[PDB]
Write a protein that binds this ligand. Structure first.
Ligand code: O1G
Ligand code: O1G
Ligand code: O1G
Ligand code: O1G
Ligand code: NA
Ligand code: NA
Lengths: 439, 439, 439, 439
């Protein structure tokens, strides 16, 4: 039996189970899309999987290194020499052209992203925040319009709504995935609601079928904040517009800020294109057709960088899945003792961030001791809920919000270091620290 | 007498006069600031002016090259090999740090810009448009507030006002500089005015002393749109906030989008710093103190590129001034014949764009024949005035606006090719075509 | 314990042992001297050793590249693109100065070399041969004086002695290191002896403590030919003068001919400076104080090139040690079988060349079959001993010389390809041919 | 009548007389040899002399510049940006080859030089000094042999003879050209004399006819020191070997040290080739056929530089002749008043240095006042005669030497700044100082 690896999360998990022998029924080929470039070079020979693949030594370079300390996300580790070499070579081609803002590599990256997402229209933007603001204006959001969203995302999700004058309406998360609870959304719908803005937090997709069911009944749009979820299988099937970020810390990043708007909806795509560049008619600069717009297309220079770095996407995502499975398998004893709750392996998760829950009040102690006693940095994404910031807006509009689940989970969440060029020895050091602090 | 070349417009003009023998007892030294680095290596030795400089042959590489056509702004010509080699060098240093968005080059570029503008506080941003939006919010603009501005700037100026819900109030330009007429500002002030937004159009400064007199009487803020005017002597002396753009077409540009907010006002600088980065407290990521903000700081990668390219700013500004003077001197007869109006040489102008006025209704014919008969591209920055776009906003709010001078000048203006890597042979081709089409 | 990497032989061996995990709980910082520039960039982060270094994959770029032949020293492989980019950068600074022979980079390189060798005085010369000629004059060599030296060096060593009219007196090598046998020196001393000229052949130091013991008894000077040994720890400790070569094939080279004279002795340094420039008093051009001299200082241009290329010296020397250790370890079975003798790993060797001995008279067969059958070039440095040339000098003076060890070793020696930009795949191709030809 | 400009001194004088209108009946073409490249590009169109040549403005960029001070030979002025651009261009092709000592550009430069000199054999060397020493060894000079030479050359001439153990025998110069008096040579021949070493001092050729007549009678070689005289018509007609220097201050220089041996004598040329590289058989490295040799071939990198710089030779020599004529015409009055003696214009002089004689004891006064009062540097090439250095050799061997005309001339000689990129305003400043100090 034969699977063609598409570069997305489902097939990465299927390949991993093959690499580990949890399966032997299956043979693999790999498609020639750009996000598969590195995986194909590293793990395949003549479109056949190499026979002698040692995940520990060949993919993670395991060599019994002695570790002294763990930073959560050392940004030098997120880019490889291979990537740098490719970036320098492409920039030697782009720089003499003098096209750094407008240019032909933006269109190419838009097409690559459009193929990878199976979506007809892509507008590459100067950031995921800008993509979200432009997308909200394209569906007609006016000041005072309400947008339903969770309260545990990065500040950008709420800020894009606020920047255009609209009003966040917070809904509680579910009990299993850190995502907006579909069963709480309907009761928060008012005559002012226009949009549901679910977040695929930490790289895990929301239950989009149920959210679409509700949005159709209420004739609401869905804009999906997928800034942490590139590569997740079937991303965007039910959404009107899907928002990506290509910030450098994302699973796929450029070398600066960038993002994208993705849709099948031609009218919405056209309005996005106009809003993202000053309100001008597309291809008629200086001639406004919308009342205003932003200076929010991607830079040609970053698009060219991104066409190099996206070559590593499926492979780095495969490394993330392996790391996550290792945390799950090696921390299971702490969950069986009912000290922590672990994520479960699912076929949609791309493991941008790896959350655990430390229960019965111990989270701060565990995080503090990991750092002070074992020199392990862990982090909390994010440290303040949307309805709890020290702001005039919160004091004026959000003091009556209670989000029971979100608030309880927030007292328990802790993120563990997980990034694709981490060493297995580094993960072992984290694993030993977590076990030892819970003894 | 001994003068230090500071890298700004006044000293560049004095240097040009000395190179050309219009002043005699003049020694020069060159200040060792980054924007002078190229001028110091090309024209100075032992901190004195080289004796053997020939402007036409050494600065413009005149060779009697044969020219067959002229493009207005071929973007490959705006960056030199020397700049490219330096940009590859600094990319090799920045890329392995993995610092692409936040980073240390952003702070250094802010310090360089603060030194060159003699201002205490600089927030480097993701574009000049973003700089303008943030600055407007920093002075307290709320939806419905009015901003007094001209109607002949690039769309970005009005768009920044509109995107935060404010209302442009358009005032006519003066009769001599394409800038907002100070004598028409006061009658446009209402209870809703919060800011005057003069634009230093084409590289020429507005009459800021008069505008400040009015602003002080009405206790109004001034935000100066200086996106075209970097290098202009005494820029900002009377402004609360100055906006710069480092778009690649500007007199100084990076290799993508960027800009800056410059101020001596610490309160405004702090608010700018918070609104440019999600409303977070300064250095307190994910902890909001303002109600929202944007994702609008410069990319560290672009700051590094800008620290390399700004080395060319004073030298490129000097080449622009010489080109401008050459147009003025060689087209004098067409003005004496009352066919065109020429700019005047002034100490503040950095000649981002070179406007002439074709009078007696001939502008369209001169533009079209220059291209179709003489193979010379000219342009009109900008083709539609702010109150004349076919937008809902204009149809609803601006149909009674009459800006007599702006509208009359708009029928006569034409921009001639002017960019610092032009050949004098290319400028000669322009000049001959302008003379011939006006026989 | 913390060790500062100095960039010399001994600390490179300690660093390689740490990287390979032959020591534990060694931490490293790196000295900020110019010869360590590349090693600091590539291997350290915040003045600590990077945790994620994989020698084969990151330092040698191993990719299982297919190899079909091996050349011994392809000169295009001795210089990297990084070096070229830096050389072009510094040529852009030096060329407009017009300073190409005399100039300030020569001084800077003399200071760098003096700091690296821990010596007070450095005269940078036009070649190592010139450095040795000048040095011999500086210690007072007159025509007819004898200089004790080995017979297995490059011809330059004997040529410098002969060019000033002095007489080589050849002494046999020891049985373990290719270097002059200290126990054979005293018997060759006559009333004419003025200098002992040991050669640190192939990168390995001679036994300088014992040679100094003899020299002191007989009031002899020692000039050390260290032209192959830059970076060897404690070089020069017992020598009056040390000679270096910066020819492009050395462990550190420029892009042309250059070398240096290094000494703590101010009298000799002054006389070297005088003889290396026409016999002129120091800084007194055209005014002789010595009877004559040569035109033998370094070119300023080569000195500037040297300041760029030397940045790679410690890293390239580290790579050479790894390559040497891999030959020793992978060829051990052939020494066990009594087919070959291998060098030992020692803290002083910088591995400019990698000698083995092929015993039982098989050297010529193995060399020829490695080439003809296996497409591997090896070489013999040097093919003719000093007393065995068909020259009038040899036929008149050296026909009674018997140098038993030198002659026997000369029948067995064979150099294997070894240069820092070799691939490990290329070294594997050499290893396989050597194993195979000795089946 | 039609002349084809060959690039040598005679045709340059002819061409100068045409550019000035002192000849009417003469048409010019120019040959396509490398030393004519810049003159052909600058002054010709389709192998015809440009109609419109203004020597002052087109060749000297005369622009009524205001001069403050004169340095005798500022080395930054000896290289043009055109040359620098070409040098960077050729090194971008040379550096990746890794051929920096041995290489193919050396052979090309030898071929260009042999054609320019009309000689069959050229050995490009690491300096002129090295060329001279190798040449003397090639004709069989042994320690104690005598070499007849003048006492007023650069120290290299005598040093090369001394360095190999031979004995300079000084002969007085003539009354008209600073060159060895042929009428005083024969009286200095002893049974030890082996060679006459005339020097083409300051760019002026010695009377080689009468010298060759003497050498034939006595079976002596002639080695001509032409290190200052490249471009001189009919150079080397009568000499066995002609020495060149390509030092960067010469009329043609590289960017470092280099020179050449030029001969028609194949036996000498072969011996020179061997002595210049360690005594090895040609194309048989490491196999000595001579007793010793040097490391004295040109660097391939310098040969590549020289192929770019020699493009400017004929044009720069033309500039020198104009400057020299201009000094002669404008100082004529001082010679008429019997205060100075001036050179006369001749067809062989390439004007490397411009000598005058200040008579009646005033030379020191004029030199000192020119510098103290007028900030004009002049110089004396050379400050000490060969038999007057305070060296042990002079005390032992040359105290009896009296060279009447040399010594008298030496009391009178002063050199005036002359280099091709000098400005005519600079030369005017020198002229004015010279007149004003002599009234
Ligand atoms: C769910 C979601 N929606 C929307 C967005 C907005 O996506 P941009 O507008 O493309 O960032 C984000 C972005 N999040 C990261 C953030 O997690 C942190 O690492 O900090 C970086 C910023 O860190 P630096 O400023 O140091 O790059 C942010 O990019 C996001 O995560
Ligand atoms: C007065 C003023 N205020 C404000 C602004 C806004 O400054 P950013 O936000 O930094 O651009 C500008 C910018 N203007 C140029 C525009 O002239 C044209 O060339 O088009 C480019 C855009 O061309 P590309 O998209 O091809 O870069 C613009 O950058 C400006 O000129
Ligand atoms: C021990 C000793 N002392 C003294 C010397 C003299 O050091 P320079 O005078 O600096 O070379 C040397 C030099 N040796 C090399 C030689 O090994 C060979 O590769 O050939 C090149 C010559 O090769 P090319 O001419 O192709 O560069 C020589 O540089 C030397 O090795
Ligand atoms: C007649 C004659 N023979 C022979 C020679 C020997 O020619 P190389 O061996 O090629 O120089 C020379 C050279 N002379 C100059 C000297 O004039 C002065 O400018 O000083 C420079 C040195 O100045 P720098 O060291 O600063 O380069 C010397 O090169 C020479 O002139
Ligand atoms: Na933006
Ligand atoms: Na030499």
């Amino acid at each position: 039996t034969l699977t063609t690896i598409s570069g997305h999360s489902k097939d990465n998990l299927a390949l991993l189970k093959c690499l580990q022998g949890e399966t032997k029924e299956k043979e693999f080929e790999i498609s020639n899309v750009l996000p598969n470039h590195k995986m194909k070079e590293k793990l395949f020979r003549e479109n056949k999987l190499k026979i002698d693949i040692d995940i520990e030594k060949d993919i993670f370079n395991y060599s019994r290194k002695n570790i002294q300390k763990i930073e959560f996300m050392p940004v030098n580790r997120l880019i490889s020499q291979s990537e740098i070499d490719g970036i320098i070579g492409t920039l030697k081609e782009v720089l003499p052209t003098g096209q750094f803002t407008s240019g032909p590599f933006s269109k190419k990256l838009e097409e690559v992203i459009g193929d990878y997402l199976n979506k007809k229209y892509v507008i590459a933007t100067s950031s995921g925040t800008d993509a979200l603001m432009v997308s909200l204006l394209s569906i007609g959001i006016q000041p005072g319009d309400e947008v339903i969203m969770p309260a545990n995302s990065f500040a950008a999700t709420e800020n894009a709504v606020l920047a255009i004058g609209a009003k966040p309406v917070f809904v509680d998360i579910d009990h299993k995935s850190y995502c907006i609870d579909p069963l709480k959304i309907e009761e928060a719908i008012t005559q002012k609601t226009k949009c549901i803005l679910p977040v695929h937090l930490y790289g895990k997709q929301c239950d989009m079928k149920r959210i679409r069911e509700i949005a159709d009944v209420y004739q609401l749009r869905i804009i999906e904040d997928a800034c942490q979820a590139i590569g997740s299988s079937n991303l965007g099937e039910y959404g009107d517009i899907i928002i990506l970020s290509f910030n450098p810390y994302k699973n796929f990043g450029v070398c600066g800020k960038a993002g994208a708007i993705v849709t099948n909806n031609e009218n919405l795509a056209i309005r996005c294109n106009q809003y993202s560049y000053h309100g001008f008619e597309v291809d008629k600069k200086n001639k406004k057709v919308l009342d205003f717009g932003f200076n929010s297309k991607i830079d040609n220079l970053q698009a060219a960088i991104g066409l190099e770095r996206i070559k590593f996407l499926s492979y780095n995502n495969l490394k993330r899945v392996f790391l996550a499975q290792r945390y799950i398998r090696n921390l299971k004893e702490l969950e069986d003792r009912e000290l922590i709750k672990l994520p479960r392996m699912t076929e949609d998760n791309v493991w941008h961030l790896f959350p655990i829950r430390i229960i019965n009040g111990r989270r701060d102690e565990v995080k503090n001791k990991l750092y002070q006693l074992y020199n392990i940095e862990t982090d909390i994404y994010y440290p303040v809920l949307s309805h709890k910031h020290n702001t005039k807006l919160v004091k004026k509009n959000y003091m009556q919000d209670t989000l029971l689940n979100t608030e309880q989970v927030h007292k328990e969440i802790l993120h563990l270091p997980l990034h694709p060029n981490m060493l297995l020895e580094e993960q072992n050091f984290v694993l030993e620290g977590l076990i030892n602090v819970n003894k």
